[PDB]
Amino acid sequence: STPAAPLDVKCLEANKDYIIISWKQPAVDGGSPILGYFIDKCEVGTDSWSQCNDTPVKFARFPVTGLIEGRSYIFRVRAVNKMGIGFPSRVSEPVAALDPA
Numbered sequence: 040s041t042p043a044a045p046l047d048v049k050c051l052e053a054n055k056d057y058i059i060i061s062w063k064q065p066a067v068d069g070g071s072p073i074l075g076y077f078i079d080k081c082e083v084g085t086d087s088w089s090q091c092n093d094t095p096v097k098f099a100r101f102p103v104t105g106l107i108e109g110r111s112y113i114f115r116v117r118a119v120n121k122m123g124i125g126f127p128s129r130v131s132e133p134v135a136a137l138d139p140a
Contacts, residue, residue, distance in 0.1 A: 042118040042125040043067035045076065050134045051100065055108040058134050061100045062116045071120040078103060083111040083133050095119045106136040 043065035051059040064073060075095025079088045080103055091103045103114070112134055115127040 040069045040071070040120075040122040042069045042071075042073055042120050042122075044126045045116040045118050045128040048114055048116055048128050048131040050114075050131065053134050053136065054138045055136045056106065057102045057104050058106065058112065058114075058136065059100060059102050060114050060116075060131065062128060064099070065118050065125065068118075069120050069122055069125070071122060074119045074121065076101070077117045077119065077124065079115050079117070079127065080112045081114075081130070082107075083113060088115070108136055111135045 045062040045065050048060060048062045051061055075097045077095055078091045078101045080091055081088045114131040117127045118125045
């Protein structure tokens with residue numbers, strides 16, 4: 040009854056101050072509408088996950104902030120419906136918090 044995991048977590052843009060991520064809605068919503076999404080981050084050296092947003096976001100392209108310039112991060116997304124929070128997506132590829140070019 041909680042939703043399935045979001046799919047295909049990806050990075051659209053990175054710089055040292057924010058990283059934009061997207062994903063795709065889960066194919067299964069648990070029989071209730073997806074109310075939104077939690078995006079978690081984990082520094083590549085670690086196993087410690089932090090929640091990037093306090094309240095779910097409806098949309099599928101989140102700017103992650105609270106980054107340390109030069110550290111690299113992997114991300115996951117959890118979907119929420121009225122029943123609660125589903126299991127996290129597969130983790131993303133690593134992204135460095137560096138300005139491009």
